[PDB]
Symmetry: C2
Subunit: 99 residues, 2 copies
């Protein structure tokens, strides 16, 4: 799919049996999702953005279907107001920027 | 140019006669640059991201050369640790996401 940018690049994702909307974000090193329950063992971690760092939980090898393309990777969970699909997963679905 | 995402999508921009590096960011509604001097008249504004909002100065119709492609649009200036090229300018250079 070719996605233009006049609107926020929001896509449908499926994780843990749940359906959600997430932002395909070229400016995020990592993938960070709003609060939700995931497969158990996690490591503490912090992430920075504009205006301040937040604490998040890091889960490894998590399956995530992004607009129909499966990918497994590290997923962080914490107090972000929007679901963010970062480069770690964008590279897995073969996503690129073009102009 | 086709840009993959294994590394941060940083490009060379030219603004106000200055050369800088900026992040092509699909997750930013606006374009926000680190502190710098611009063409005079500006309006106050705030932007939110992960962990907290910051105050910025909004400048209108600012010329900006992004990796060789000129674009004129609104550019914000404030305390961001990285130069961010948002969707308002990404649409002007015909930038799209593809997978
Ligand atoms: C969504 C977040 C994961 C995203 N942040 C990141 O990718 C940041 C750079 N990385 C980040 O937190 O990675 C780990 C780290 C931990 C400790 C010290 C230094 C780095 C973010 O807010 N990204 C925004 C831009 C941005 C980047 C840096 C600073 C301010 C704004 C939009 O693209
Ligand atoms: C670089 C910023 C301009 C960027 N933020 C934006 O584009 C935000 C949504 N927009 C934003 O501030 O626009 C104006 C606004 C003003 C007042 C109230 C509501 C909205 C950002 O931090 N973006 C990161 C992700 C993000 C977005 C929302 C919340 C947390 C993290 C990476 O893509």
């Amino acid at each position: 799919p070719q996605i233009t940018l006049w609107k926020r690049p929001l896509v449908t994702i499926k994780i843990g049996g749940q359906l959600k909307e997430a932002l395909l974000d070229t400016g995020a090193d990592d993938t960070v999702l709003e609060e939700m329950n995931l497969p158990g063992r996690w490591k503490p971690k912090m992430i920075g953005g504009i205006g301040g760092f937040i604490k998040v939980r890091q889960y490894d090898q998590i399956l995530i279907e992004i607009c129909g393309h499966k990918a497994i990777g590290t997923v962080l969970v914490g107090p972000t107001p929007v679901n963010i699909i970062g480069r770690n997963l964008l590279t897995q679905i073969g996503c690129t920027l073009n102009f």
